[PDB]
Amino acid sequence: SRLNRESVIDAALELLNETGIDGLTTRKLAQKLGIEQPTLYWHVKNKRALLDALAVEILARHHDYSLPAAGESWQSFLRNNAMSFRRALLRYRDGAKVHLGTRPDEKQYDTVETQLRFMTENGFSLRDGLYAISAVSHFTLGAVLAQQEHTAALNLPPLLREALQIMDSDDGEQAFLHGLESLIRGFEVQLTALLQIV
Amino acid sequence: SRLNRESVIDAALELLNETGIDGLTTRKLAQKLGIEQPTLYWHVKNKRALLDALAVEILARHHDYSLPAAGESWQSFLRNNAMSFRRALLRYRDGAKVHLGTRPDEKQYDTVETQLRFMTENGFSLRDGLYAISAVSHFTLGAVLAQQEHTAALNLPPLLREALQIMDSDDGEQAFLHGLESLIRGFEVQLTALLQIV
Ligand SMILES: Cc1c2c(c(O)c3c(O)cccc13)C(=O)[C@]1(O)C(=O)C(C(N)=O)=C(O)[C@@H](N(C)C)[C@@H]1C2
Ligand SMILES: Cc1c2c(c(O)c3c(O)cccc13)C(=O)[C@]1(O)C(=O)C(C(N)=O)=C(O)[C@@H](N(C)C)[C@@H]1C2
Ligand SMILES: [Cl-]
Ligand SMILES: [Cl-]
Ligand SMILES: [Cl-]
Ligand SMILES: [Cl-]
Ligand SMILES: [Cl-]
Ligand SMILES: [Cl-]
Ligand SMILES: [Cl-]
Ligand SMILES: [Cl-]
Ligand SMILES: [Cl-]
Ligand SMILES: [Cl-]
Ligand SMILES: [Mg+2]
Ligand SMILES: [Mg+2]
């Protein structure tokens, strides 16, 4: 079939959903595209190259709160951005694992730059803006990974028994959103303290 | 060589450091132990069984702040526990990935129960105690994974360039510890608010 970048990525994302990240291979991608492997090689050199591109395209396609709204608070931007990021990672099987280890791509430079600049325009030093952004990303990635890897993996004292019931009651969104608010408020307490002991 | 549980786990942890999680296989474990695979099978049924045990034993061996000190504040316990947890996951290659997806083992029941009870004894509902514990775990796992998966994976606008320099300056501990304080303070703001709008 068609082997331009867009179609190769379409097919690879479909495959990712079928196989997961560990089970995703260039060989299976070739088959899905109805081609021989040396034909695929011209287009996609190896799995790493493929994963790198998927990590970019999953956000490009499904992560639509990359930028603050006009006038939006930094609190609200981090919240909306974290929720968007979470949703995008959850959209494909092992999506968080696909993201893990990556760095912003040239195609994301202006987007991530803008976010860093935005934090600095709201009173954060680059450093603290970065630490806030990173903490949100890590918290979000950790939460999604827990959800996704638990699924893949598929007596009790009483609190643990009930804790496990609480976690088996929804997908993880409640715990995530509750933690997200704690995180953001913590950033605000820090930002507002300036040089005061806090 | 010797094939009691302790020695199999010793060998598998050494192998994990050599190969990483994806590259860890029962076949390579057999070789490292100088045995045939059907001999290993008697002892270890598959990779999943092996990973499950490694996840338990890495904490049992190296995660020594499982429990609060007498009189310790919940703030301090979460801090110490998160740092201990982080250190233990970092001790082996892909250690965070080994942990991911697991649930407490029967051998950890009393430990995790105690932590849940402890939170409840300091004013948290089981729910909120759990959400605090989970958020800490997810934040910690996300931070470690970022560090570990970045390593495995191994023009710029100016803030991104500097951000990347800041991140290439240390291992991730600074950003982690800064985020951890934000998280814990956020939990405290929530706990203290009770039914007040906050
Ligand atoms: C600033 C930054 C970001 C990310 C990132 O990986 C990163 C890094 O690896 C080193 C230095 C800086 C950054 C994100 O992955 C990303 O997910 C992302 O690409 C991104 C995006 N493209 O919209 C985001 O929404 C950001 N958000 C989750 C906090 C975050 C921004
Ligand atoms: C309470 C709990 C915990 C963990 C956990 O996975 C879990 C779960 O999957 C479902 C319900 C409850 C829990 C931890 O992994 C663990 O890492 C852990 O086993 C653990 C331990 N064994 O000491 C901890 O230190 C805890 N800490 C990182 C917050 C945390 C406790
Ligand atoms: Cl073509
Ligand atoms: Cl194209
Ligand atoms: Cl492959
Ligand atoms: Cl706002
Ligand atoms: Cl990452
Ligand atoms: Cl023996
Ligand atoms: Cl033994
Ligand atoms: Cl295997
Ligand atoms: Cl204390
Ligand atoms: Cl997990
Ligand atoms: Mg990233
Ligand atoms: Mg766990």
Burial degree of B110 (CB within 10 A; 0-12, 13-18, 19+): middle
Q: Give the number of other CB atoms < 10 A from CB of residue A45.
A: 11
3-state helix, strand, coil in chain A (%, to 5): 75, 0, 25
Query: How many Å apart are CA A154 and CA A147, to the nearest integer?
Result: 11
Q: Which domain holds residue A99?
A: 66-197
What number of CA atoms fall less than 13 Å from residue A61's CA on the CB side?
16
Query: How many Å apart are CA A186 and CA B185, to the nearest integer?
Result: 5
B151 and B173 together in one domain: yes
A75 and A58 together in one domain: no
Burial degree of B168 (CB within 10 A; 0-12, 13-18, 19+): exposed
CA of B136 to the centre of ligand 2 (A): 10
Query: How many Å apart are CA A55 and CA A2, to the nearest integer?
Result: 21
Query: How many Å apart are CA B50 and CA B9, to the nearest integer?
Result: 8
B154 in Cβ contact with A159 (< 8 Å)? no
The string over B31-56, giving b where at least 16 C-beta atoms fall within 10 Å of a residue's C-beta and e elsewhere, is ebbebeeeebeebbeeeeebbbbbbb
Alpha helices in chain B (DSSP H): 5-23, 26-32, 37-43, 47-62, 74-91, 95-99, 109-121, 126-153, 158-169, 173-193
Residue B155 to residue A106, Cβ atoms within 8 A = yes
Residues with CB under 5 A from ligand 3 (ion): A 2-3
- Which of A47, A100, A173 should be substituted to probe chain B, the one whose Cβ sees the most B Cβ atoms within 10 Å? A100
Q: Which chain A residue has the Cα nearest residue B104?
A: A160
Query: How many Å apart are CA A73 and CA A90, to the nearest integer?
Result: 26
CA of A4 to the centre of ligand 3 (A): 6
Query: How many Å apart are CA A2 and CA A15, to the nearest integer?
Result: 16
B112 in Cβ contact with B126 (< 8 Å)? no
A153 and A78 together in one domain: yes
Question: B102 in helix, strand or coil?
Answer: coil
Question: Which ligand number lies closest to the CA of residue A70?
Answer: 6
User: Which residue's CA is minimally distant from atom 9 of ligand 2?
Assistant: B103
Q: With contacts defined as CB-CB under 8 Å, which chain B residues touch A189? A: 182, 185-186, 189
User: Which residue's CA is minimally distant from atom 2 of ligand 1?
Assistant: A112
Our CA-based measurement puts residue B186 at a distance from the nearest CA of chain A, in whole angstroms, of 4
Among residues B65, B80, B98, which one ends one of the domains?
A: B65
Q: Give the number of other CB atoms < 10 A from CB of residue A121.
A: 11
The residues near B50 (Cβ < 8 Å, ≥ 6 apart) are B12, B24, B26, B29, B44
Query: How many Å apart are CA A112 and CA B156, to the nearest integer?
Result: 11
What number of CA atoms fall less than 13 Å from residue B43's CA on the CB side?
22
Domain count, chain A: 2
Query: How many Å apart are CA B107 and CA A110, to the nearest integer?
Result: 49
Which ligand 1 atom minimizes the distance to the CA of A103?
A: 9
A59 and A138 together in one domain: no
Q: Give the number of other CB atoms < 10 A from CB of residue B145.
A: 27
A59 and A74 together in one domain: no
Residue B147 beta carbon below 6 angstroms from any ligand 2 atom: no
Q: How was this structure determined?
A: X-ray
B144 in Cβ contact with B115 (< 8 Å)? no
Nearest Cα neighbor of A101 from B146, B10, B87, B88 is: B146
A181 in Cβ contact with B198 (< 8 Å)? no
Query: How many Å apart are CA B179 and CA B182, to the nearest integer?
Result: 5
Distance of CA B144 to the CA centre of its chain: 8
B110 and B34 together in one domain: no
Our CA-based measurement puts residue A97 at a distance from the nearest CA of chain B, in whole angstroms, of 9
CA of B193 to the centre of ligand 4 (A): 53
Our CA-based measurement puts residue B147 at a distance from the nearest CA of chain A, in whole angstroms, of 8
Our CA-based measurement puts residue A34 at a distance from the nearest CA of chain B, in whole angstroms, of 28
**Residue with structure tokens 């890897």?**
A149
The residues near A12 (Cβ < 8 Å, ≥ 6 apart) are A24, A29, A44, A50, A53, A54
B183 and B127 together in one domain: yes
The residues near B121 (Cβ < 8 Å, ≥ 6 apart) are none
The residues near A98 (Cβ < 8 Å, ≥ 6 apart) are A16, A21, A51, A54, A55, A58, A92
In angstroms, the Cα distances linking A40 to A3, A22, A27, A34, A46 are 8, 19, 9, 10, 9
Query: How many Å apart are CA B139 and CA B119, to the nearest integer?
Result: 18
* Identity at A7, one-letter amino acid code: S
The residues near A47 (Cβ < 8 Å, ≥ 6 apart) are A24, A25, A26
B89 in Cβ contact with B99 (< 8 Å)? yes
A189 and A103 together in one domain: yes
A36 and A128 together in one domain: no
Residues with CB under 5 A from ligand 10 (ion): B 25-26, 47
Q: What is the DSSP letter of B58?
A: H
In angstroms, the Cα distances linking B171 to A104, B160, B174 are 18, 18, 8
Query: How many Å apart are CA A129 and CA A116, to the nearest integer?
Result: 7
Size of interface A-B (CB pairs under 8 A): 182
Residue A160 to residue B104, Cβ atoms within 8 A = yes
Residue A181 to residue B166, Cβ atoms within 8 A = no
A70 and A128 together in one domain: yes
B72 in Cβ contact with B127 (< 8 Å)? no
Residue B24 beta carbon below 6 angstroms from any ligand 2 atom: no
Q: Which chain B residue has the Cα nearest residue A155?
A: B106
Query: How many Å apart are CA B44 and CA B189, to the nearest integer?
Result: 47
**Residue with structure tokens 């709201």?**
A122
Q: What is the resolution of this structure in A?
A: 1.9
CATH number of the domain enclosing A133: 1.10.357.10
The residues near B101 (Cβ < 8 Å, ≥ 6 apart) are A146, A149, A150, A152, A153
**Residue with structure tokens 């959850």?**
A90
B51 and B110 together in one domain: no
B166 in Cβ contact with A127 (< 8 Å)? yes
Query: How many Å apart are CA A90 and CA A18, to the nearest integer?
Result: 15
CATH number of the domain enclosing A27: 1.10.10.60
Residue B113 to residue A159, Cβ atoms within 8 A = yes
Query: How many Å apart are CA B74 and CA B63, to the nearest integer?
Result: 18
CA of B94 to the centre of ligand 12 (A): 13
Among residues A48, A65, A82, which one ends one of the domains?
A: A65
B29 and B71 together in one domain: no
**Residue with structure tokens 């998927």?**
A54
In angstroms, the Cα distances linking A47 to A25, A67, B153 are 7, 30, 12
Residue A163 beta carbon below 6 angstroms from any ligand 2 atom: yes
Nearest Cα neighbor of B183 from B74, B104, B64 is: B74
What number of CA atoms fall less than 13 Å from residue A57's CA on the CB side?
17
* Identity at A27, one-letter amino acid code: R
Among residues B22, B39, B65, which one ends one of the domains?
A: B65
